[PDB]
């Protein structure tokens, strides 16, 4: 229920389930294959 | 990789591994990457269909909770003989999210934030002590809260003409009413607030370090509209802020040492562990000592 | 394969035979400011090879009691070469960086350095309510040293500093670290003389140690601005 | 008009409510969004990043010294090196980590953890360790022959300088709860122990003591519930310059 | 040319120009036209996609804000011994938008205005001083606000039969209620209000200059319905007006010198600059002096 | 009836709210609309009209004299004539203009400005000037050789009596803010300076001093945000005859 | 706004009422259901046991 | 939400984005071509 | 009427008329035929 | 100037390219070492660590 004319008046938006943890966990140019030695 | 995640990941059953040249348990921390070892590669697992949701850790849910940001008590009375520093039936507050440590630490978990701010104002009143030695009742006063942008003209007295609020947004509310509520939009001149600012906001060298006024939401001027009664009261106004429509960037190490000032990140630490400058974690006797060992 | 690396920018090149991959901050690569994010309307200058090149700072000595070192960008480069000249002659600046930290020793040496790029490293002062002054923050080329690296000089934790883009120099494993930093700021461009987007920190978590004959073990920092552009041409400030 | 009646809870102010509210600045146009690196949309992304454990949380260990564990050559076999307690709720080596700090904002937790150890000795240093996770129920093992019966990894020092011990989610219940009773059956996770597998062997010119750095992170099967005020921060008075905001 | 404008205009990249007979930077002020020189023709520009909205400067948003237009305090008590000029539990107000300078200046930015007026009435009460030396509480009084057209019969006393309001619009409201609100339509006999009127509204030569009664919205008569209590109170009524459905014509130079009277545009100016008769802008040492020069 | 519950903010009076309200005069028929010249629908239309700058805001300049700048023949080359500060928020030559007056009702502003100078000397008077905009960061230039490094236009007096210097929007941020700190990095715009390019040369029978009139306007890339009460007007008491409205 | 008027019984607390109410823990994910023997859905099932 | 019978009771109308600044900026009978001399 | 975003906020659910009393009344492996002797 | 940072390792040799950077098509082998048609610049070597 939002009868206000300004969109920023609306309630919270809790529907953004998209994630990209690799930008923090694997920020390397060369992806690391599972099992194989890293170096 | 970017993907939609609604539940915790499932587990697949795994078998014995005796493969040459494959060492999933070994990693290279030096690259800066987090270990990619999976439970299936470390132990023999079963199949588990995981239905645990992840919605309560959403950044929106994490931050969109009304938290106290300001609390001001002042005397509602005749202020003819009141000192200059006293709040004479009104007060002004430069809006900031650094005075109460819970919300401050939660916000400072991130480098950049973009959000609208739902503001809730709750007022309480009590009959003054050290004035009259009696209770008569509590008035249903009308208060005015006016939003004045940072640095602009603020009222100098309770009956100042500045309260006419020709253009400034003002909200009038009663104590008997439910707490007042208004949404302030994301008003930064940039695309996001700078939770931390490694710079000086002036073109000369005398400016404040770490304080970007572009991240200051504004000024709240709160007055009691009613003229003073023959007896005095104490009025307490609490302002709560709830971020919403939140976007967050660059998470940061959480604050460990106690906060010292709202104007900087200065640190002293507790006298001893925990959260001391030389020891964050509480001490144990030795690295071989198990603090809460089960002994039967 | 992942241990050897050559970086070539402008007229400068660096080769390492003991690298450990390299880190692209937040999985991003530097780029010029697009038209749909631009604010300043004047045509920018893009010096390319004149400014997008490796500048090597003064080396520091890794000692037993070393607490760590830090350099603030673009402050550390603001008086160096054509990048410094363009910074001094323009009101607005924008660029990323390519950071290469070098530290070699023998196979009998041990030690571990955390090399971390902190965005908006707002420093705090110790045991006082007064905010840090201008001279405390702006050290220029020489940089500074950590007073309390355990708390990152800001009341946070060194242990959680891995949330920032980072690598390690573990002397038994590698002799160099490489971090690529995109433009990181709330605004598309900034005044380079009053705000630092990034802070490079090198912290010896494991101190240098050996029982062989002692030698000076320096740490050297080479920083290459990337996709430099400048706006608001006027007279030099300097 | 519409006939109506007020329900219980009318007029209340619930801090976790979710409603629209009056815009104080009509027709305001917020600054256009611009791409910024490092956007985070779920805190579980943060807890998957490994951070340093404070295993050496003892007296005589000051500051950074608490973040590394020193290992030396021994003359007895199968010796215990160190142990790590389980609770990411109570104060301990896991408390001041990304996973610990974020989890202490919540009450219930589930999922597997990972502990990654990096050896920081010289190139000429060699050795084998054994890292064991013991599910709860008994005392923390003090001998290798007992600890090796639980989950374990044997780590050989070499070119790959780091090893990972997975602490799998082994629990009777769907979640464990971050309660103050460390010995509760709904909270205890077990123990982590480290033993010499063979020995630390170094030549004369190498350092005779070598350091390990321990890191902890949560896997992608990790989840949290029942947000709460973090016990890691608090105040007993107003901060400095807070009063100046009213002047 | 008439067109729909929702955002600020974009910038196109431009190249070097060395064309004979083309001088876009030169203009002729004498024609009365504003210079048409574009940034592309003055300097070399880049391409900028401008997404800045222009909605907050819409005339409707500019003027449709509730602004205080009247504030009247009067004693609610037994007025048997009250003087003739005192407001005996009621008052009358000829509606005007010239008493409070913020709204007045904003309205006077235009020559002609057409709008409906949302009127909000807010009431506050206090226990009287100099009467009883005690506080007992605040009553929840009922007030009546009656709209009487300009020049028509107004009530002469609190219990006057004129308050029966057979045809006049009346609103009854309590202090404990939210502030009363009613919309008055655009009631001018002309197609638009004359913000400024260069004429006399009478057929003889003694009429008021600059005052067109056709632009006077009307008369507000406000009384306390309750009969007086044994003790006296002070009641303050504030009337706020918000224009809406606004059309505006012929913008004007803004007022600079302080207002002197609600009945005319008479001016005196401040004693010295700024906003003095001989100097509107504050003085600087010389035309070569930079007041806030950056010196490092 | 319908079950309902009151939210926080119920009963409040927000001056910027936007709701329908009860018509006090039912079936009222407003006067029919009639076309009137000069309709304005956005205040940005007004700020695009150029108005006179008060460059000569000095003592000994009274009234209209403050609206013109006098230039005379000089015997030294490359001499500075005048300068204009940047802030359309603080008091200055730009304050009492259409753009300045309208902008001071708001807090944030963006876009390019234009300054148009009209030469009001005699027909026989000749000369060349240079007008420079210097982006902020340093001191206001005091010599031509420094000022000419910034944005500039060289103006030759002639049949076209007026020249336009564009102050393009050159800012790190999307908007600047109308704050009271003139030296803030979010407020300072730079400087405008005027220098002799060659000289003012007039014959004997012409006036030896000639006047320039400066105008400022906003371009169509200009925008404003965060409306506020204008500091240009105020009152400390009721105006005359305001009390008579209650009699 | 919508014109309304309050009916008798407004504001009362009836212990047998049946209405929705504000969730105190937004985005909370309850523990997944697991089959448990002996579910009872009507008390009349119990009274049929001797 | 407007259940009143009189149209002037409605909320504010903030949707008129039409502009014609030329009626104030260029109120001349002969339009001025860009670049060419005005006189 | 449930405008809340969390499903557990909803009113009571009194529409589950399914029963299985035999799980308490006849929890035996061999069903007992009516009329015939049990043993 | 133009430079290469050389790390000692398994590949024991490094190459610094002195590119042809000249105003004229050719330089001349004349006896005046400071002539603008002869001077090529300098090569220097510094410790990096």
């Amino acid at each position: 229920i939002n009868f206000y004319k300004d969109s920023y008046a609306a309630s919270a938006s809790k529907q953004d389930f998209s994630q990209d943890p690799s930008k923090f966990t694997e920020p390397v140019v060369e992806g690391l294959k599972a099992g194989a030695p890293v170096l | 990789i970017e993907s939609i995640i609604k539940t915790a990941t499932d587990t697949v059953k795994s078998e014995i591994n005796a493969e040459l040249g494959v060492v999933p348990s070994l990693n290279a921390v030096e690259t800066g990457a987090t270990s990619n070892t999976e439970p299936e590669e470390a132990i023999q697992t079963r199949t588990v269909i995981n239905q645990h949701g992840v919605s309560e850790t959403l950044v929106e849910n994490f931050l969109s909770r009304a938290a106290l940001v300001s609390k001001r008590s002042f005397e509602y009375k005749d202020h003819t003989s009141s000192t200059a520093r006293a709040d004479k039936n009104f007060f002004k507050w430069t809006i900031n999210t650094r005075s109460f440590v819970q919300l401050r630490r939660k916000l400072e978990l991130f480098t950049y934030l973009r959000f609208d701010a739902e503001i809730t104002i709750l007022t309480t009143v009590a009959v003054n002590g050290s004035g009259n030695n009696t209770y008569v009742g509590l008035p249903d006063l009308t208060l005015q809260a006016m939003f004045v942008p940072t640095g602009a003209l603020t009222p100098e007295k309770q009956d100042s003409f500045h309260w006419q609020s020709g253009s400034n947004a003002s909200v009038f509310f009663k104590i008997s009413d439910p707490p007042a509520r208004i949404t302030i939009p994301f008003m930064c001149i940039n695309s996001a607030y700078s939770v931390f600012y490694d710079g000086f906001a002036g073109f000369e060298k005398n400016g404040l370090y770490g304080i970007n006024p572009a991240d200051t939401i504004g000024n709240l001027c709160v007055r009691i509209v009613n003229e003073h009664q023959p007896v005095g009261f104490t009025v307490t106004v609490r302002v709560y802020m709830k971020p919403k429509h939140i976007k967050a960037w660059a998470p940061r190490p959480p604050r460990t040492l106690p906060y010292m000032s709202i104007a900087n990140a200065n640190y002293k630490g507790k006298e001893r562990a925990p959260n001391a400058l030389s020891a964050i974690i509480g001490n144990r006797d030795s690295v071989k000592t198990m603090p809460h060992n089960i002994v039967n | 394969s992942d241990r050897v690396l050559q970086l070539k920018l402008g007229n400068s090149a660096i080769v390492t035979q003991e690298a450990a991959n390299y880190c692209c901050a937040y999985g991003e690569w530097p780029n010029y400011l697009p038209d749909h994010e631009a604010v300043a309307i004047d045509k920018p200058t893009q010096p390319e090879t004149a400014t997008d090149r490796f500048y090597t700072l003064k080396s520091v000595k890794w000692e037993t009691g070393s607490t760590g070192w830090w350099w603030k960008l673009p402050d550390a480069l603001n008086n160096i070469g054509m990048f410094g000249q363009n910074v001094q002659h323009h009101y607005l600046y924008r660029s990323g960086f390519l950071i290469h930290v070098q530290c070699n020793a023998t196979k009998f040496h041990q030690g571990a350095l955390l090399v971390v790029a902190i965005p908006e490293h707002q420093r705090g002062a110790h045991n006082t309510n007064t905010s840090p002054g201008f001279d405390d923050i702006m050290k220029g080329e020489e940089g500074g040293t950590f007073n309390h690296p355990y708390v990152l000089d800001d009341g946070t934790s060194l242990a959680c500093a891995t949330i920032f883009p980072h690598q390690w120099i573990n002397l038994r494993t590698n002799n160099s670290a490489t971090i690529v930093l995109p433009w990181m700021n709330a605004a598309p461009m900034d005044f380079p003389l009053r705000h630092n987007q990034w802070t490079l920190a090198i912290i010896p978590v494991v101190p240098l140690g050996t029982r062989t004959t002692s030698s000076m073990v320096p740490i050297t920092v080479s920083i290459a601005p990337m996709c430099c552009e400048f706006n608001g041409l006027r007279h030099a400030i300097t | 008009g519409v006939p109506t009646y007020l329900l219980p809870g009318s007029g209340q102010f619930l801090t976790t409510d979710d409603h629209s509210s009056a815009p104080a600045l009509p027709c305001f146009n917020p600054t256009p969004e611009m791409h910024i690196p490092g956007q985070v949309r779920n805190m579980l992304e943060v807890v998957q990043v490994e951070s340093m454990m404070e295993i050496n949380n003892t007296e005589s260990a000051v500051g950074m010294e608490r973040l590394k564990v020193d290992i030396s050559a021994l003359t007895d076999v199968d010796q215990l090196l160190f142990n790590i307690p389980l609770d990411i709720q109570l104060d301990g080596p896991l408390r001041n980590t990304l996973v610990g700090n974020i989890s202490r904002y919540y009450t219930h937790w589930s999922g597997s953890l990972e502990m990654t150890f990096m050896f920081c000795g010289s190139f000429m240093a060699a050795g084998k360790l054994i890292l064991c996770y013991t599910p709860p129920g008994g005392s923390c093992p003090t001998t290798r022959e007992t600890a090796m019966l639980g989950t374990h990894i044997v780590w050989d020092f070499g070119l790959q300088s780091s090893v990972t011990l997975i602490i799998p989610w082994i629990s009777g219940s769907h979640y464990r709860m971050f309660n103050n009773d460390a010995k509760s059956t709904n909270a205890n996770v077990g123990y982590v122990t480290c033993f010499m597998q063979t020995n630390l062997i170094v030549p004369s010119e190498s350092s005779d003591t070598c350091s390990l750095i321990g890191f902890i992170a949560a896997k992608d099967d990790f989840s949290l519930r029942l947000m709460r005020d973090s016990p890691d921060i608090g105040q007993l008075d107003h901060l400095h310059a807070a009063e100046a905001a009213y002047q």
Side-chain angles (χ1 to χ4, degrees), chain C residues 17-86:
Chain C
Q17 307 195 61
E18 298 195 63
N21 212 310
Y22 67 79
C23 169
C24 306
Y26 305 116
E28 305 256 323
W29 197 261
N31 59 270
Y32 289 115
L33 174 69
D35 300 329
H36 62 84
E37 310 193 317
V39 164
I41 66 164
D42 60 319
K43 180 178 200 273
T45 185
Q46 290 170 348
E48 294 175 276
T49 58
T51 61
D52 308 345
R53 63 180 304 287
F54 278 111
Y55 303 103
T56 291
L57 310 181
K58 176 182 199 193
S59 300
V60 297
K61 294 184 191 184
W62 190 353
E63 313 286 32
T64 52
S66 286
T67 63
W69 310 261
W70 54 267
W71 297 262
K72 290 186 175 303
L73 299 169
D75 176 43
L77 299 178
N78 275 343
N79 196 37
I80 299 182
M82 285 315 290
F83 179 92
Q85 286 311 308
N86 274 280

Side-chain angles (χ1 to χ4, degrees), chain B residues 2 25 27 30 35 37 56-57 70 72 92 94 181 183 188 191 242 250 280-284 293-294, chain D residues 17 21-22 31-32 38 41-43 55 57 66 83 95 106 139-140 161-162 164 219 226 243 246-247:
Chain B
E2 175 131 335
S25 287
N27 299 90
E30 295 88 355
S35 162
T37 307
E56 235 200 307
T57 48
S70 159
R72 193 56 168 189
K92 182 273 312 187
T94 304
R181 181 175 275 174
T183 293
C188 190
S191 294
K242 180 183 88 158
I280 294 161
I281 302 301
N283 288 317
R284 58 177 164 151
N293 203 18
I294 303 294
Chain D
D17 73 345
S21 85
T31 298
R41 286 155 290 190
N42 196 303
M43 305 312 297
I55 300 155
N57 61 309
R66 306 165 75 76
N83 50 30
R95 196 256 290 169
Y106 294 83
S139 276
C140 187
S161 73
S162 301
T164 291
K219 304 299 303 177
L226 219 174
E243 169 65 17
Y246 300 89
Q247 307 297 274

Side-chain angles (χ1 to χ4, degrees), chain D residues 166-185:
Chain D
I166 295 291
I167 309 169
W169 182 246
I170 298 174
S171 190
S173 288
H174 278 266
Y175 293 88
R176 281 171 171 116
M177 32 189 318
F178 280 143
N179 81 329
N180 263 319
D181 181 19
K183 311 196 169 161
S184 157
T185 59

Side-chain angles (χ1 to χ4, degrees), chain C residues 5-24:
Chain C
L5 172 63
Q6 179 155 340
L7 313 168
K8 189 200 85 202
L9 282 88
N11 66 354
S12 69
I14 299 176
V15 288
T16 169
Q17 307 195 61
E18 298 195 63
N21 212 310
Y22 67 79
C23 169
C24 306

